[PDB]
């Protein structure tokens, strides 16, 4: 909702409450999953060509008792945009690989989980410096590219570490050395085609015997396709990764091949059914694991839109992973899940 628009400054205050419940034989995901998100997007006109902006988004879980608080910052960044040249922003933001993979992250509840948060340059993460050029100086409609740098996020401070520390340090599964990446997308009418590449130094804390997938750098290569017209949405992405994909709590995959596909239709009366397939196939994993499925599921669901502010959905994760030693060791969910959600948003 735009709550302020005066003398060239605009402020949009937005959010949602998702009354949400999971049904699953897996009791670690089963039960109340209610949550809310809040955010703001602000923009200020500096000149006719130059605009400054900032965005912040926060998630607060609504499913805990009052003696605890489970909340986090999704994004927080400030930036400058110049008409027909580009933009730059810095902060917690999305990695440029997400420019392509976001195209299949459109499912009612699940999806978008061949990668995670704080996972090199694949999704949300800290310390992104992002440069973007839209429409190639305004001379090629629909063509966009981006180049991104990520600074090191290392070991926690004040915990007796003698190397690799940063002020905002964290556990090794969520660390990263310096990284660089890029994306190109082209959209003509309904069609879209895109590609992205990322390369991040891996830290010493990540390259210990306690984690599978030791390596100097984490690399990702992504291609994507999209069709979005005539009430039909189709998209697919394929990603090859090296020492970049987490294998639950075990560490990372030496190599992984990720694939996601989605098909959706929008009825006039407000119903939007969705069908999707995701898989992540790991190779040469180490410790005798050899080749294993990290993720494999079919997602069938539907959303009903009452209007732009109220909707309800059901999403059914038909989980094709089988319960074995590998998935047990990594703590990967192999059970089906049904989600039922009712969402108010502004």
Partner 1 sequence: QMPSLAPMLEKVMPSVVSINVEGSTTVNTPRMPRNFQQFFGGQQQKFMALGSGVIIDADKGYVVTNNHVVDNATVIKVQLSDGRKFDAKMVGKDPRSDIALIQIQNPKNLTAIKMADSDALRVGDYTVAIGNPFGLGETVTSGIVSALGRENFIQTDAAINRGNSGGALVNLNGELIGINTAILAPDGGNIGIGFAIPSNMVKNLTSQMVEYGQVKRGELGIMGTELNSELAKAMKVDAQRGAFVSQVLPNSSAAKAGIKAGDVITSLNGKPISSFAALRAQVGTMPVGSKLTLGLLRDGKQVNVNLELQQSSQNQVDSSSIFNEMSNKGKDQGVVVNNVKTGTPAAQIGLKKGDVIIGANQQAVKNIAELRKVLDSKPSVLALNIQRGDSTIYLL
Tell me how far apart the alpha carbons of residues 94 and 176 are, in angstroms, rounded to a whole number: 14
Return the number of the residue (83 or 309) whose C-beta is nearest partner 1. Answer: 83
> What burial class does residue 200 get, using C-beta atoms within 10 Å of its C-beta: 0-12 exposed, 13-18 middle, 19+ buried?
buried
List phi, psi (to 5°) of 113. -130, 30
Whether residue 168 contacts residue 155, with contact meaning beta carbons closer than 8 Å, is answered with: no
Tell me how far apart the alpha carbons of residues 77 and 61 are, in angstroms, rounded to a whole number: 22
Structure tokens at 81: 């945009």
3-state secondary structure 49-77: CEEEEEEEEEEEECCCCCCCCCEEEEEEE
Find all residues with CB under 8 Å of 213, minimum gap 6, and list them.
243, 247, 251, 252, 253, 254, 285, 286
Strand partners, 316: 300, 338
Return the number of the residue (202 or 272) whose C-beta is nearest partner 1. Answer: 202
Instruction: Provide the 8-state DSSP code for 202.
Output: P
Find all residues with CB under 8 Å of 217, minimum gap 6, and list them.
177, 199, 200, 201, 202, 242, 243
Return the number of the residue (85 or 318) whose C-beta is nearest partner 1. Answer: 85
Q: Least CB distance from residue 51 to partner 1, whole Å? A: 11
Find all residues with CB under 8 Å of 261, minimum gap 6, and list them.
104, 235, 236, 276, 277, 278
Q: Least CB distance from residue 93 to partner 1, whole Å? A: 10
Q: Which residues bind partner 1 (CB under 8 A)?
A: 79-89, 95-96, 120-121, 125-140, 144-154, 158, 163-166, 169, 175-182, 198-204, 206-207, 215-219
Return the number of the residue (154 or 341) whose C-beta is nearest partner 1. Answer: 154
Binding-site entries: 319, 321, 334
Return the number of the residue (241 or 327) whose C-beta is nearest partner 1. Answer: 241
Return the number of the residue (61 or 87) whose C-beta is nearest partner 1. Answer: 87
Return the number of the residue (111 or 154) whose C-beta is nearest partner 1. Answer: 154
Candidates 104, 152, 150, 103; CA nearest to 131 is 150
Task: Count the alpha carbons within 13 Å of 140 in the hemisphere toward its beta carbon.
Answer: 10
Q: Least CB distance from residue 283 to partner 1, whole Å? A: 18
Collapsing DSSP to helix, strand or coil, 326 comes out as: helix
Q: Least CB distance from residue 207 to partner 1, whole Å? A: 7
Q: Least CB distance from residue 209 to partner 1, whole Å? A: 15
Q: What is the distance in angstroms between the CA of the first residue and the CA of the last residue of the chain?
A: 6
Q: Least CB distance from residue 52 to partner 1, whole Å? A: 11
Q: Least CB distance from residue 91 to partner 1, whole Å? A: 11
Q: Least CB distance from residue 74 to partner 1, whole Å? A: 18
Binding-site entries for Mg(2+): 319, 321, 334
Return the number of the residue (72 or 88) whose C-beta is nearest partner 1. Answer: 88
């Amino acid at each position: 909702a735009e709550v302020y628009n005066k003398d060239g400054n605009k402020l949009d205050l937005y959010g949602k409450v998702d009354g949400l419940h999971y049904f699953s034989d897996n009791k670690d995901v089963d039960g109340d999953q209610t949550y809310m998100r809040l955010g703001f997007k602000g923009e200020t006109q500096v000149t006719d060509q130059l605009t400054g902006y900032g965005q912040w988004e926060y998630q607060i879980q609504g499913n805990s008792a009052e003696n605890e608080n489970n909340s986090w910052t999704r994004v927080a960044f400030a930036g400058l945009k110049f008409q027909d040249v580009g933009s730059f922003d810095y902060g917690r933001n999305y990695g440029v690989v997400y420019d392509v993979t976001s195209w299949t992250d459109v499912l009612p509840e699940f999806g978008g989980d061949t990668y995670g948060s704080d996972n090199f340059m694949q999704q949300r993460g800290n310390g992104f410096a992002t440069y973007r050029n839209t429409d190639f100086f305004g001379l090629v409609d629909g063509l966009n590219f981006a180049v991104q740098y990520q600074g090191k996020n290392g070991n926690p401070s004040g915990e007796g570490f003698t190397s690799g520390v940063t002020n905002n340090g964290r556990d090794a599964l969520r660390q990263n050395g310096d990284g660089v990446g890029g994306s190109i997308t082209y959209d003509y009418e309904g069609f879209g085609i895109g590609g992205a590449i990322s390369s991040s130094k891996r830290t010493d804390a990540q390259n210990t015997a306690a984690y599978i997938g030791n390596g100097d750098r984490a690399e990702t290569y992504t291609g994507g396709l999209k069709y979005d017209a005539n009430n039909i949405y189709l998209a697919a992405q394929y990603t090859q990764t090296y020492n970049a994909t987490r294998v639950g709590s075990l560490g990372w995959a030496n190599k992984a091949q990720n694939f996601e596909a989605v098909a959706q239709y929008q009825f006039d009366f407000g119903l939007r059914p969705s069908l999707a397939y995701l898989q992540s196939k790991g190779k040469n994993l180490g410790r005798g694991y050899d080749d294993e499925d990290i993720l494999k599921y079919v997602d069938v669901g539907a959303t009903y839109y009452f209007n732009k502010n109220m909707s309800t959905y059901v999403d059914y994760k038909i989980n094709l992973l089988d319960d074995n030693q590998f998935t047990r060791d990594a703590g990967i969910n192999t059970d089906n899940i049904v989600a039922l959600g009712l969402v108010y948003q502004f």
